[PDB]
């Protein structure tokens, strides 16, 4: 009668950067299924009545103006280059303002995001590569120069920023139902 | 800081001849980060060659780039009259992205003596208490010309200013304007005002003068 | 049309600040790096600094490190270059350059150039010119042709525009570049050569316009 | 109009812990766009930033003050406090509380200070506290017929700084000069406060100097009359 | 750590003069600079922020300008109340730092009024005698006070104190205290302070006789 480890995901003291978003695989357990809460392809009042093959718990941090991108069929720097959800996504997205946890007076430059990438991310793709991005014709060869920039930047979360620039911790729960046996049942 | 030195400072060539411009850096720069530009009179610079030897879009094939390390070359195989401009090289792989002093390309032509004209000050100006006497040297080549002012056979120095037009797009000549500035009081004390012109196209210096 | 359009001419008192604009059109501006270069009248190009695409990460030459700030606005598609503590030696034409880009790919060099912004630093206020005739005479004729002109004198700042007969006269015109007089004001002359026999039956008017002072003058040059 | 009223002891023995409090008036301390800061100024020296704080807890301290600085906020009392531990004589300074405006956007110009507390001098010393003696500085009998005379109060042998002097309960300020205290060889401070008044008023107008020395709970009102012979 | 260097350290200008103070940053901080005015005994008062934006409630004769590394504060017409120490502050990087300050002094030469005060009978009851000499409302700041006790020049037993510049007439005041024992005070008779100053064509001596009214 194992209980699903949701406490470890929502109540984690430190969250991952959006470009290196974390995923917790949850299986073979019983779950008791100012917050941004949007579900897609499935109703929340029905999750306690459904069993799934696997439930994937994706967690990361973005800024407030970027939470609208964590959704199916969305475009933008976060959706295309950091964390993409498929068009037929079945699950829920949860976000809450974490300005009291992830913002420092001198600036919390620890949280990063990808700015440049040659192509768009596939659904659920995680790219932690930090190779010098070639924006021109000449080969960069790991040289930060003209048309050769570093692909990651910092959020620099400060408490004096506006809500659109304040940190938001995001937890994306994917509900998978392939073949296999259904082990994650709500109760 | 990388120093870029271009030579020669000025190149005067007949149309159809081949031009050859030098760009040299105080240290080796990567060939992909050396660019050549062309700036025509009254225009912004235009990218000609980048990556040492890659012609930019729209640049005619008679422009050619070459070189590596510390010695780069721009070659204009058949010079056209429209190719008159200042040509700059720039390295932009190591900050600061320094420029060269540029090479000015004139269109060759034969020696042409100037036409000298003098203009006394107008009465409207003399009412203002000042007097400007103007000497005009029209349609000459080469650009080197000496203009000397004489007031009652007294050589003037330090009270005249000169100006030269850009090279003419049709006949490739220059024109110069020298202005002698005197007070109305000083101007009324004298009689013979003359500008003496020395130039390669003249057998001996030419003097244009008037009597007040 | 792939374009880079800079702001208009400026006159700034010594010790003040100027902020030159550089708006883009045609290409993806957010993907495009931008460098700033200036050129003093009759000198060589001088590199000021450059800024990387996407972020505000700028890099400057040591000469301008203390007082030049290069910024960019992604929403309005415009880059800026602010030069504080202006002094006499800063008078120059300031250019912005950028490689053209689409959404993913960029050129390998700076092929897009702005038209340039002329900034002049001086302590003197604006002043319209005085237009004096350069009347034709026996001492300004040669071989059937005569020369005449206009003396555009004692103005500030640059520039002035001179045409002849409302633009009907272009052949044989020479408008010389202005010289900076010891008074701090500029002085220019424009001349034209015409056949001597036209002096009696044809009128010649030089059209002088000094936009900074809103001074338009049409001066008729009659034989002397 | 936001006001800041600081308070706390002006005397702290060496190795003890300095403690000061600032009370915000005309506005709540749970400001979402301001920091609450402390700044100190050694006597005869410049300004040194100590630290800044957001109401919800986050702090930024000066790395030049090691780990002996703590700022705190009491939202329920509209107060924020400063605690500086293991103080030395190098900590003797006038301490100010102030309000710092924070940025609302990335790379927005902020971080200036407005308004400020009035300033509290904290003297790091073991020496014991002593209240002053107030002696009159009587106007000279000679003086003039109808010109101007001078009188004052001598505030002698007190520690630590400061004392405050007013005249006639604040109704006399024109012509008043209260001199900076001098540290006597005895280790105790001393100062004089003088005022120039017309000579004709010396018999008809009373002059009292009001001497306050908070560290010793001393309040002295001293009348200054022309001396009788 | 961003260091701010303020030049000059001191300056003295006349009323109506145009004053210019420079603040040079060790690195370029764009326009992240503010100016403060601190009058004696008062907290610093914000004048300019963002290098050139005047604070609401500051006279228009104050103005700031500059960008990058060098910034200037200008007082177009100096007034007597403008006597203060002015500080610049960088507002870009932590830790927040100030410049060293520029003390601005103010006028025509003004001679001092001199007064001498005997030790009160209340203090003589305590065993110590203090003799105070007052130099009132003089400019410039430099003044010389000699203590003579029976025409014997004293040294080593007197301390001085000078007020900050007055915010209305721009003058200074000085007090000199002669400290003696009650026994030593009663041994001599004539007490005098002799004052010299730029505004005095010859020394001024205010004296009293111990005991004599």
Numbering used by the authors:
A (entry chain E): 333 to 365, 374 to 527
B (entry chain F): 1 to 212
C (entry chain D): 1 to 224
D (entry chain H): 1 to 229
E (entry chain L): 1 to 106, 108 to 214
Task: Kindly provide excerpts from the paper associated with this entry.
S is the major surface glycoprotein on the SARS-CoV-2 virion and is involved in viral attachment to target cells via the interaction of cell-surface-expressed angiotensin-converting enzyme 2 (ACE2) with the receptor binding site, at the tip of the receptor binding domain (RBD), in the S1 fragment of S (Lan et al., 2020). Following attachment, cleavage of S releases S1, allowing a major conformational change in S2, exposing a hydrophobic loop that executes fusion of viral and host cell membranes, releasing the viral genome to initiate viral replication (Walls et al., 2017). In-depth structure-and-function analyses of 27 potent RBD-binding mAbs isolated from vaccinated volunteers following breakthrough Omicron-BA.1 infection reveals that they are focused in two main clusters within the RBD, with potent right-shoulder antibodies showing increased prevalence. In summary, we have presented a structure-function analysis of potent human antibodies induced by Omicron BA.1 breakthrough infection in SARS-CoV-2 vaccinated individuals.
Omi-12, the most potent of the set of 28, belongs to the IGHV1-58 gene family, which has been isolated on several occasions following SARS-CoV-2 infection. It is anomalous in that it cross-neutralizes all VoC whilst other IGHV1-58 antibodies lose activity against BA.1, and this potency is recovered by somatic mutation. In a set of potent early pandemic antibodies, the IGHV1-58 gene family was the second most highly represented (4/20) (Dejnirattisai et al., 2021a); however, they constitute only 1/28 in the Omicron set, and it is notable that other IGHV1-58 antibodies such as AZD8895 and representatives from our previous studies such as mAbs 55, 165, 253, and Beta-47 show large or complete loss of neutralization activity against Omicron BA.1 (Dejnirattisai et al., 2021a). The structural basis for the retention of activity of Omi-12 on BA.1 appears to be a somatic mutation in the HC CDR2 loop (V53P), which allows the RBD mutation Q493R to be accommodated. (G) The somatic mutation V53P contributes to re-folding of the H3 loop so that Q493R can be accommodated in Omi-12. Omi-2 belongs to the IGHV1-69 gene family but has features in common with Omi-12, the only member of the IGHV1-58 gene family found in the set of 28 potent antibodies. In particular, Omi-2 and Omi-12 have a disulphide bond and Pro and Phe residues at the same positions in the H3 loop which mediate interactions with F486 of the RBD; these commonalities appear to drive Omi-2 to adopt almost exactly the same pose as Omi-12, which differs from the other potent antibodies that bind in this region.
